[PDB]
Structure 1
Amino acid sequence: EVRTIKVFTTVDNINLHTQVVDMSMTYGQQFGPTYLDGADVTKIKPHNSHEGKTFYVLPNDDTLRVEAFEYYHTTDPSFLGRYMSALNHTKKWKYPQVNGLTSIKWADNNSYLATALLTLQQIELKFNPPALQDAYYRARAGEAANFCALILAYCNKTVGELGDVRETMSYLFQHANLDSCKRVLNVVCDTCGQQQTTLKGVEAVMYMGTLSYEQFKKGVDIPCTCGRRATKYLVQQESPFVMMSAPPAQYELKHGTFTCASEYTGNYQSGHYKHITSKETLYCIDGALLTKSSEYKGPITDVFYKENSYTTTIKPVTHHHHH
């Protein structure tokens, strides 16, 4: 005798697909890789209690391939498996409210994700994939498991794997609407003259080499191809924030001069991230932990600043000689 139950399959947890499954065959024999709220049930046969429940599957048919792309903006074949695998862990993490923001209690080497999530709640950023829009809204309300699992999937990081905050933000920004962001730079060499460049989108809001926005406006020394040290400085900026990054180094964060920052203690193989936010005082959020101070000095790697529109008032030759 053939026994069956009705279940629903999905790739986006919105659009459902009715299935009649044979209770003598595993989900994998019938759907391929199958997950129940992150749990891998591929090798499990249907239970009575599964009737009417929704299972994630991989995009096997054309219908599912379109739904998955429209929701996630990826066609990487393993994406849904990686998201589900991560979700099985992140649904067990805790997301405490710390100083009015959703943080993450430490687990599974997740300090880089905690400071990324805290940072997002302090900068103006809109995501493009519906999956991130929906999950980020939930994360702001305090239910951040799906958002964290999506970050891991989009960044191709597994739970427990070491992550870099700058790289994680770069991926998040790649999936955000930054088309209104513009940056104009000028590079001045005594030998080679002046070279202006215009950057757009993610490249307009990220810079690697100095933590100081003020120093970037004054001028930073970089190598020129001729071998001399040229001066690079910010000509014009149109964006709601900027992110300045550098290899970790002792750095003083002054209250009221920045939005938030990330601190990395450790080395290239093992470390830990903390988050610093400048509000009525300086708050240091370390997952679930919170401390305060009037001054802060530590190995800072990333600093975020507010912006709207900036235009330099100084001529190039003045930046080259006075930075």
Structure 2
Amino acid sequence: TIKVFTTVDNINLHTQVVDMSMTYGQQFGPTYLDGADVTKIKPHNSHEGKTFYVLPNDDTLRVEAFEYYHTTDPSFLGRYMSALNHTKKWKYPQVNGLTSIKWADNNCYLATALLTLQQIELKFNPPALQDAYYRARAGEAANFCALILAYCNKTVGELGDVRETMSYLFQHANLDSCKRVLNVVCKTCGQQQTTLKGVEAVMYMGTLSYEQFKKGVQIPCTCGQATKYLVQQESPFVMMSAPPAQYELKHGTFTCASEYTGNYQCGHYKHITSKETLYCIDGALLTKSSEYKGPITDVFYKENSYTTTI
């Protein structure tokens, strides 16, 4: 026999006692240790005193599960533990003061998102996301990367899009105060203004230039071509995205950007960040230059309050 702590959040610990004749699944259900499925494994002598993750099987664990993860998905823990088994083996080197990831298991899009998150202002709603976010900014990013995969319904090795990953993460963050007011001017229909809140207010797909979005872009109208432009923007940042194309990044005019080279889906991401000079972070590799020209698909800008002059 061995005394054992079970948990769903690694906060509230529930004392249990097991007999070593029965595997952990026979007494706790699906059980995990440091990301390893110890369900069909009988208790060992070193397993005494440790804390294990268990699938919620009573109401107390279900409530503690939601309050920490903000999900009731019964598959979340398993997917989370399965990713952590890989992410805990990745290397997370410090590059230019930022925590990056050495290349492994097609994680280039995860490293780019990780580096981007360390340069924009985000408050995550699930306490599990926020705690791992803090630990990741301090260098321990294995649990944060595993949570990103689980929250995005992606597995280790799967090909990932950075813009889609940031969008899913934005939906789990507090962006209620974010507001975008647009105005569409059609030659026949007239003018009409709409207001966007939340995640829809901080992302645009179509162009990389924040200035071009302020000056207006061409969109088709219901009557078959109108023009939309940005009237007001209330957000700590904006994300401008477009299909990969050659683009010149000027120092001091942007926060960071996503470079994408190669074919659709199976390409490779690099991260460009604007400090005292332009830096390029490719996993564990770092290069710098005063100017940059390359295939860019995401650009991030700082913002607070903006009102047009039209």
Identify the TM-score tier after normalising by the shorter chain.
Answer: over 0.9
The 2-side partners of 1:288 and 1:57 are apart by 35
Instruction: Give the match's secondary structure for 1:172.
Output: helix
Q: Which residue of 2 aligns with 1:167?
A: 164
Q: How far does residue 210 in structure 1 lie from its aligned partner after superposition? A: 0.7
SS in structure 2 opposite 1:12? coil
Distance in 1 separating the partners of 2:265 and 2:146: 23
Post-superposition shift, 1:95?
Answer: 0.8
Residues 160 and 265 of structure 2 are in contact (CA less than 8 Å); yes or no, is this contact kept in structure 1? Answer: no
Shift of 1:251: 1.1
The answer to whether the Cα contact below 8 Å between 2:151 and 2:168 also exists between their aligned partners in 1 is yes
Structure 1 residues 2-81: aligned runs within 5 Å: 4-81=1-78
**Residues 245-291 of structure 1 deviation map (CA, whole Å, 9 limit, x = unaligned):** 11111111111111001011122231010000011111000111100
CA deviations on 1:3-22 (whole Å, 9 max, x unpaired) are x1111111101111111112
CA contact (8 A) 2:177 2:234 kept: yes
Q: Could you tell me how far apart the structure 1 residues matched to 2:116 and 2:298 are?
A: 10
Aligned with 1:125: secondary structure? coil
Distance 2:79 2:155 in 1: 8
> In the TM superposition, what are the counterparts of 1:1-323 in structure 2 within 5 Å?
4-227=1-224, 229-314=225-310
d(CA) in 1 for partners of 2:229, 2:262: 31
Deviation at 1:195, TM superposition (A): 1.4
Normalising by the residue count of structure 1, what TM-score does the alignment of the two structures yield? 0.95
- The whole-number CA distance in structure 1 between the counterparts of 2:247 and 2:186 is 28
Q: Distance in 1 between matches of 2:15 and 2:303?
A: 49
Deviation at 1:59, TM superposition (A): 1.3
Separation in structure 2 between the aligned mates of residue 300 and residue 77 of structure 1, nearest angstrom:
38
Structure 2 residue runs of 5 or longer lacking an equivalent are none
What secondary structure is seen at the aligned counterpart in 2 of 1:19?
Answer: strand
Q: Using the TM superposition, give the Cα deviation of residue 188 of structure 1 relative to its aligned residue in structure 2, in angstroms.
A: 0.9
Moved runs in structure 1, 4+ residues, more than 6 A? Answer: none
1:76-103 Cα offsets, whole Å, 9 max, x none, are: 1100011111111111111111000111
- C-alpha deviations, 1:156-201, integer Å up to 9, x for none? 1011111111111011111111111110001111011111110011
TM-score, normalised to structure 2, is 0.98
Give the Cα separation in 1 of the matches to 2:118 and 2:290: 22
* Percent identity of equivalent pairs: 98
Structure 1 unmatched ranges of 5 or more: 315-323
Aligned CA RMSD, in angstroms, stands at 0.8
Q: Secondary structure at the match of 1:275?
A: strand
SS in 2 for 1:135: helix
CA distance in 1, matches of 2:191, 2:170: 30
Please report how far the alpha carbon of residue 224 of structure 1 lies from its aligned counterpart in structure 2 after TM superposition: 1.3
Cα deviations across residues 87-137 of structure 1 (Å, max 9, x unaligned)? Answer: 111111111110001111111100001010111111111111110111011
SS at match of 1:49: helix
- Cα distance between partner residues in 1 of 2:195 and 2:265: 35
3-state SS, counterpart of residue 66 of structure 1: helix
Determine if contact 2:161/2:265 at 8 Å carries over to the other structure.
no
